[PDB]
Amino acid sequence: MKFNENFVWGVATSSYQIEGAYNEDGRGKDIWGDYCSIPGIIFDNHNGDKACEHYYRYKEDVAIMKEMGIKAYRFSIAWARIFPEGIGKINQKGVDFYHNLIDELIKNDIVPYVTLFHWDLPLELAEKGGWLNDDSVEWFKDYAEFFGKEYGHKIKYIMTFNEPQCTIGLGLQQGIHAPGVKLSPKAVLKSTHNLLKAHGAAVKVLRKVAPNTQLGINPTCGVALPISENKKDIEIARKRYFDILDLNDAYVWSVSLFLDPIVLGDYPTKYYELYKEHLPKITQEDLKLISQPLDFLAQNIYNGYRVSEDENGNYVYPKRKAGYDHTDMGWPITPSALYWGPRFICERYNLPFYITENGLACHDVVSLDNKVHDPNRIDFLNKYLLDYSRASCEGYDIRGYFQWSLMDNFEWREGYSKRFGMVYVDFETQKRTIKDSGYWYKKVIEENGENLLEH
């Protein structure tokens, strides 16, 4: 019994990365399409105008998902495809599209998992300040309210914000993601506060208009890994994993900054002390709105880092061995992150836990045999599921795993130079090719993980 019988095996995509049709059927502009229009921002000036054309080819992608026997599909809704201006007028062809997509999923016995916001903020609301605007809490509530009223009767799982660490940190504090700016701590924490408030308002209104839909959120962070399994070393990694970082660091990359207000009802104590001169207006109704009860907690986990302390109690980060296992991103391959991550999150928050994203980039090619061989992805996934199974076997309330991605897509700043899918996509012909990892993943679902090679 590596995993439980109810375990959920899924793949994950996002709207801007696969859909295409950025300027068709009344879809409004968003921040990433706007971000891409700045020359030199994206690798080779790629954009998401066409992407994988999933908007037009969704039936084929669902047929491919049935071919691999995938029972759950995580995807995101393009806010600008339903509300071209963020608020007000409804774009029916965008409403019809997600109807056609959802119906195709149900028709093929695939359970939809919906992400409301996957970074594609409607450009009209960004030009109104984005998450700096206190009205953004209402913009997202009305967005969530319409989606719950229109689709709640056939969507059982909804998560609000995918990886707010990127939207806030890379987008507004580090200038790495859209809109690409580096704002003040006041702006960043005010933007953080309104995003959390928008999350809670979305949860509260979805309990009213879609009461049979389970709600959650999937943040992300590097997983602090203990140097050994001694209680003294595990506590160092646990403290770092939920720490609040200094203002001169990339302080948005914190687990507790977002999830402690959501699950525990307030920011950590360190937040009020370190950020005292940059604190936003925080009322108790704010914290009450943010801390709505959730049905599940999720997390995108890709890698982790060893962490320790010296004599003075300062964090020490040991080097990685020369030639260490890595991906086409240069990211390290650390399968133990899928154990310590879920373990730390479950112990601190005690909610049903999903892994919403896990995977790696591989320099995949269509070989001479017209197949795509990615055994490195098979090894990466197999090793990560082994440590994830250990957490399930140890009694933690683990519910599922969504492998990023289903198909190669637009990898943001990297464009199409990085391939994360188990399905190969030639971005000219739009020809799909299932990789060896896809057929291997089909057997994993059918065996519920009892085929995972050990050691």
PDB file of C-alpha atoms in Angstrom, residues 13-122:
ATOM      1  CA  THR A  13      -1.860  23.009 -17.146  1.00  0.00           C
ATOM      2  CA  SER A  14      -2.691  26.718 -17.058  1.00  0.00           C
ATOM      3  CA  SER A  15      -4.679  28.972 -19.363  1.00  0.00           C
ATOM      4  CA  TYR A  16      -2.097  31.417 -20.725  1.00  0.00           C
ATOM      5  CA  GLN A  17       0.497  28.658 -21.141  1.00  0.00           C
ATOM      6  CA  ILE A  18      -1.582  26.359 -23.392  1.00  0.00           C
ATOM      7  CA  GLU A  19      -4.776  28.051 -24.569  1.00  0.00           C
ATOM      8  CA  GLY A  20      -3.633  30.537 -27.144  1.00  0.00           C
ATOM      9  CA  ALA A  21      -6.334  32.606 -28.835  1.00  0.00           C
ATOM     10  CA  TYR A  22      -5.102  35.638 -26.896  1.00  0.00           C
ATOM     11  CA  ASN A  23      -6.751  38.107 -29.297  1.00  0.00           C
ATOM     12  CA  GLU A  24      -9.705  36.046 -30.512  1.00  0.00           C
ATOM     13  CA  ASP A  25     -13.338  35.484 -29.494  1.00  0.00           C
ATOM     14  CA  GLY A  26     -13.368  38.632 -27.379  1.00  0.00           C
ATOM     15  CA  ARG A  27     -10.626  37.655 -24.922  1.00  0.00           C
ATOM     16  CA  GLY A  28      -9.216  40.702 -23.179  1.00  0.00           C
ATOM     17  CA  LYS A  29      -5.546  41.442 -22.692  1.00  0.00           C
ATOM     18  CA  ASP A  30      -3.757  40.325 -19.524  1.00  0.00           C
ATOM     19  CA  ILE A  31      -0.519  41.260 -17.792  1.00  0.00           C
ATOM     20  CA  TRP A  32       1.560  38.454 -19.316  1.00  0.00           C
ATOM     21  CA  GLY A  33       0.553  39.222 -22.892  1.00  0.00           C
ATOM     22  CA  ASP A  34       1.410  42.830 -22.074  1.00  0.00           C
ATOM     23  CA  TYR A  35       4.656  41.769 -20.382  1.00  0.00           C
ATOM     24  CA  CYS A  36       5.672  39.807 -23.494  1.00  0.00           C
ATOM     25  CA  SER A  37       5.231  42.859 -25.742  1.00  0.00           C
ATOM     26  CA  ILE A  38       8.348  44.391 -24.140  1.00  0.00           C
ATOM     27  CA  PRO A  39      11.295  43.310 -26.332  1.00  0.00           C
ATOM     28  CA  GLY A  40      13.943  41.165 -24.670  1.00  0.00           C
ATOM     29  CA  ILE A  41      11.743  40.119 -21.744  1.00  0.00           C
ATOM     30  CA  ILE A  42      10.865  36.608 -22.970  1.00  0.00           C
ATOM     31  CA  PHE A  43      13.327  34.133 -24.482  1.00  0.00           C
ATOM     32  CA  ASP A  44      13.505  34.930 -28.218  1.00  0.00           C
ATOM     33  CA  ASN A  45      10.491  37.237 -27.697  1.00  0.00           C
ATOM     34  CA  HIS A  46       8.063  34.340 -27.406  1.00  0.00           C
ATOM     35  CA  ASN A  47       4.520  35.011 -26.236  1.00  0.00           C
ATOM     36  CA  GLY A  48       1.271  33.186 -25.574  1.00  0.00           C
ATOM     37  CA  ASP A  49      -0.651  34.347 -28.641  1.00  0.00           C
ATOM     38  CA  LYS A  50      -0.765  30.806 -30.059  1.00  0.00           C
ATOM     39  CA  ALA A  51       0.845  28.645 -27.313  1.00  0.00           C
ATOM     40  CA  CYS A  52      -0.537  25.089 -27.759  1.00  0.00           C
ATOM     41  CA  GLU A  53      -3.829  26.331 -29.278  1.00  0.00           C
ATOM     42  CA  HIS A  54      -5.631  24.327 -26.578  1.00  0.00           C
ATOM     43  CA  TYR A  55      -8.579  26.706 -27.011  1.00  0.00           C
ATOM     44  CA  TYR A  56      -9.231  25.108 -30.412  1.00  0.00           C
ATOM     45  CA  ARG A  57      -7.715  21.647 -29.815  1.00  0.00           C
ATOM     46  CA  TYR A  58      -9.126  20.873 -26.349  1.00  0.00           C
ATOM     47  CA  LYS A  59     -10.958  17.754 -27.549  1.00  0.00           C
ATOM     48  CA  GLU A  60      -7.729  16.186 -28.811  1.00  0.00           C
ATOM     49  CA  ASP A  61      -6.042  17.020 -25.503  1.00  0.00           C
ATOM     50  CA  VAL A  62      -8.898  15.361 -23.616  1.00  0.00           C
ATOM     51  CA  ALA A  63      -8.669  12.346 -25.930  1.00  0.00           C
ATOM     52  CA  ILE A  64      -4.931  12.186 -25.229  1.00  0.00           C
ATOM     53  CA  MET A  65      -5.688  12.374 -21.501  1.00  0.00           C
ATOM     54  CA  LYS A  66      -8.139   9.488 -21.820  1.00  0.00           C
ATOM     55  CA  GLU A  67      -5.522   7.530 -23.771  1.00  0.00           C
ATOM     56  CA  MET A  68      -3.178   7.743 -20.766  1.00  0.00           C
ATOM     57  CA  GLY A  69      -6.057   6.923 -18.398  1.00  0.00           C
ATOM     58  CA  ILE A  70      -5.841  10.197 -16.468  1.00  0.00           C
ATOM     59  CA  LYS A  71      -8.668  10.560 -13.946  1.00  0.00           C
ATOM     60  CA  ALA A  72      -8.120  14.187 -12.857  1.00  0.00           C
ATOM     61  CA  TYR A  73      -7.141  17.338 -14.745  1.00  0.00           C
ATOM     62  CA  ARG A  74      -5.975  20.545 -13.085  1.00  0.00           C
ATOM     63  CA  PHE A  75      -6.381  23.646 -15.240  1.00  0.00           C
ATOM     64  CA  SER A  76      -6.860  27.383 -14.860  1.00  0.00           C
ATOM     65  CA  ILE A  77      -9.549  29.820 -15.996  1.00  0.00           C
ATOM     66  CA  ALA A  78      -8.500  32.872 -18.014  1.00  0.00           C
ATOM     67  CA  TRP A  79     -10.111  35.699 -16.042  1.00  0.00           C
ATOM     68  CA  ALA A  80      -9.802  37.928 -19.118  1.00  0.00           C
ATOM     69  CA  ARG A  81     -11.536  35.317 -21.302  1.00  0.00           C
ATOM     70  CA  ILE A  82     -14.742  35.564 -19.225  1.00  0.00           C
ATOM     71  CA  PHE A  83     -14.444  39.215 -18.142  1.00  0.00           C
ATOM     72  CA  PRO A  84     -12.523  40.949 -20.967  1.00  0.00           C
ATOM     73  CA  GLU A  85     -12.239  44.051 -18.766  1.00  0.00           C
ATOM     74  CA  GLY A  86     -11.886  42.223 -15.433  1.00  0.00           C
ATOM     75  CA  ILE A  87     -15.342  43.388 -14.313  1.00  0.00           C
ATOM     76  CA  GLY A  88     -18.701  44.092 -15.932  1.00  0.00           C
ATOM     77  CA  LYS A  89     -19.482  42.711 -19.391  1.00  0.00           C
ATOM     78  CA  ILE A  90     -19.384  38.920 -19.765  1.00  0.00           C
ATOM     79  CA  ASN A  91     -17.760  37.356 -22.838  1.00  0.00           C
ATOM     80  CA  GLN A  92     -20.100  34.515 -23.794  1.00  0.00           C
ATOM     81  CA  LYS A  93     -17.706  32.729 -26.158  1.00  0.00           C
ATOM     82  CA  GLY A  94     -15.297  32.435 -23.233  1.00  0.00           C
ATOM     83  CA  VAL A  95     -18.070  31.135 -21.002  1.00  0.00           C
ATOM     84  CA  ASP A  96     -19.046  28.673 -23.738  1.00  0.00           C
ATOM     85  CA  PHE A  97     -15.435  27.508 -24.127  1.00  0.00           C
ATOM     86  CA  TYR A  98     -15.028  26.476 -20.493  1.00  0.00           C
ATOM     87  CA  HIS A  99     -18.453  24.834 -20.700  1.00  0.00           C
ATOM     88  CA  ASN A 100     -17.257  22.852 -23.734  1.00  0.00           C
ATOM     89  CA  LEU A 101     -13.972  22.042 -21.977  1.00  0.00           C
ATOM     90  CA  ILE A 102     -15.627  20.938 -18.724  1.00  0.00           C
ATOM     91  CA  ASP A 103     -18.284  18.886 -20.528  1.00  0.00           C
ATOM     92  CA  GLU A 104     -15.591  17.119 -22.547  1.00  0.00           C
ATOM     93  CA  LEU A 105     -13.783  16.334 -19.292  1.00  0.00           C
ATOM     94  CA  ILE A 106     -16.877  14.904 -17.581  1.00  0.00           C
ATOM     95  CA  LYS A 107     -17.862  13.032 -20.750  1.00  0.00           C
ATOM     96  CA  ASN A 108     -14.513  11.214 -20.529  1.00  0.00           C
ATOM     97  CA  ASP A 109     -14.610  10.442 -16.779  1.00  0.00           C
ATOM     98  CA  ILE A 110     -11.987  13.065 -15.874  1.00  0.00           C
ATOM     99  CA  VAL A 111     -12.524  15.091 -12.691  1.00  0.00           C
ATOM    100  CA  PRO A 112     -11.844  18.828 -13.203  1.00  0.00           C
ATOM    101  CA  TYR A 113      -9.669  20.718 -10.730  1.00  0.00           C
ATOM    102  CA  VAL A 114     -10.044  24.448 -11.325  1.00  0.00           C
ATOM    103  CA  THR A 115      -7.539  27.185 -10.540  1.00  0.00           C
ATOM    104  CA  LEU A 116      -9.290  30.550 -10.563  1.00  0.00           C
ATOM    105  CA  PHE A 117      -6.183  32.740 -10.934  1.00  0.00           C
ATOM    106  CA  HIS A 118      -3.021  31.477 -12.609  1.00  0.00           C
ATOM    107  CA  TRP A 119      -1.178  34.808 -12.988  1.00  0.00           C
ATOM    108  CA  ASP A 120      -3.157  36.073 -16.009  1.00  0.00           C
ATOM    109  CA  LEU A 121      -4.590  39.172 -14.361  1.00  0.00           C
ATOM    110  CA  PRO A 122      -6.825  41.151 -16.762  1.00  0.00           C
TER     111      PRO A 122
END
